[PDB]
Design a protein around this ligand. Structure first.
Ligand SMILES: O=P(O)(O)Oc1cc(-c2cc(OP(=O)(O)O)c(OP(=O)(O)O)c(OP(=O)(O)O)c2)cc(OP(=O)(O)O)c1OP(=O)(O)O
Ligand SMILES: [Cl-]
Length: 313
């Protein structure tokens, strides 16, 4: 046989749905005029805020949002469900075009709670890793700790995900698979890093003026990554969309409750590995089901394809 690099189109999405059932068609998120992706990696947070889901019960929110997403994928291609994984309200879905189904192997999913008592599932991460052709890929969906002052807990949450997430090994004599041990890592979710120092009315005003350079200079994720305390070697595209948190339900108004929570770029998509090229990075204002807005991104990722020759002598 022989081998070559081929670009396939990866969509990555993250959406914190605030414990709500889907009430809106998700084509605006998943298939907004773009070309049909080869792979869909769709992640959720706060799927179900009930006591029941928190204590590991099954939730109808799962099937509800799965169908919502299935129906939302690009109508020009037939998509195969590869894998679903959920811890409490953190759910990751992996689809691929039916063409590619035969070349997906070694699918493993795992979860890690980092919430109450540092081990429950109100916060944490879930991951699906797999081999597409001869490229190892791991997709991680995490919901890190809330609130401005808890940036150091968000750091630790990231650490625990990174050290506890262990995938199964076809060869038992080798060390278990960790997230790092992959050709391609996409990390998405409500990473929940807020705006430091600046006060609430400053932020909104700075957002109203669309100066996303000055606001970004005080973004906690940037800061911490700069201090090399989290996400070493990861990259993120330029943020050309306004903060994706926190809104009033059913509108584009900033949280008007008594908490009057400041805006933030809670919901992010980061990556690491070779031959990854980000084509877009967008939020989707139209969808008003949640107090967050959903965020998408499309990559051209170069996969190592091993194939058969045609008669060529
Ligand atoms: O790359 P891999 O390792 O697979 O090896 C090869 C397979 C075929 C091949 C094998 C077939 O089936 P079978 O071998 O019977 O399983 C085919 O179906 P067919 O028998 O229906 O004709 C075929 O026809 P298409 O071109 O794919 O239609 C091509 C040709 C190759 O080039 P060449 O012929 O120039 O040597 C070749 O490279 P190599 O030179 O390295 O051997
Ligand atoms: Cl499944």
């Amino acid at each position: 046989m022989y081998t070559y690099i081929q670009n396939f189109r990866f969509f990555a999405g993250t959406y914190n749905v605030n414990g709500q059932s889907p009430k809106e068609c998700l084509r605006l998120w998943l298939s907004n005029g773009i070309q049909a992706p080869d792979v869909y990696c769709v992640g959720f947070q706060e799927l179900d805020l009930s006591k029941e889901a928190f204590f590991f019960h099954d939730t109808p929110k799962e099937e509800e949002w799965f169908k919502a997403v299935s129906e939302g994928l690009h109508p020009d291609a037939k998509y195969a469900k590869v894998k679903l994984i959920r811890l409490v309200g953190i759910m990751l879905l992996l689809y691929v075009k039916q063409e590619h189904a035969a070349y997906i192997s070694e699918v493993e999913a795992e979860t890690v709670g980092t919430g109450i008592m540092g081990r429950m599932g109100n916060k944490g991460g879930v991951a699906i890793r797999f081999q597409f052709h001869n490229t190892s890929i791991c997709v991680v969906n995490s919901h890190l700790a809330a609130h401005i002052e808890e940036y150091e807990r968000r750091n630790q949450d990231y650490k625990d995900i990174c050290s506890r997430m262990q995938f199964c090994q076809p060869d038992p004599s080798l060390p278990p698979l960790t997230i790092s041990n992959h050709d391609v890592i996409l990390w998405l979710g409500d990473l929940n890093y807020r705006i430091e120092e600046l006060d609430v009315e400053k932020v909104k005003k700075l957002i109203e003026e669309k100066d996303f350079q000055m606001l970004y200079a005080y973004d906690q994720l940037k800061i911490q990554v700069a201090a090399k305390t989290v996400f070493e070697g990861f990259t993120e595209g330029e943020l050309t969309f306004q903060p994706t948190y926190k809104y009033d339900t059913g509108s584009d108004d900033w949280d008007t409750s008594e908490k009057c929570r400041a805006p933030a770029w809670c919901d992010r998509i980061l990556w690491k590995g070779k031959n990854i090229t980000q084509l877009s990075y967008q939020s989707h204002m139209a969808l008003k089901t949640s107090d967050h807005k959903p965020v998408s991104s499309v990559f051209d990722i170069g996969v190592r394809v091993v194939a058969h020759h045609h008669h060529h002598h």
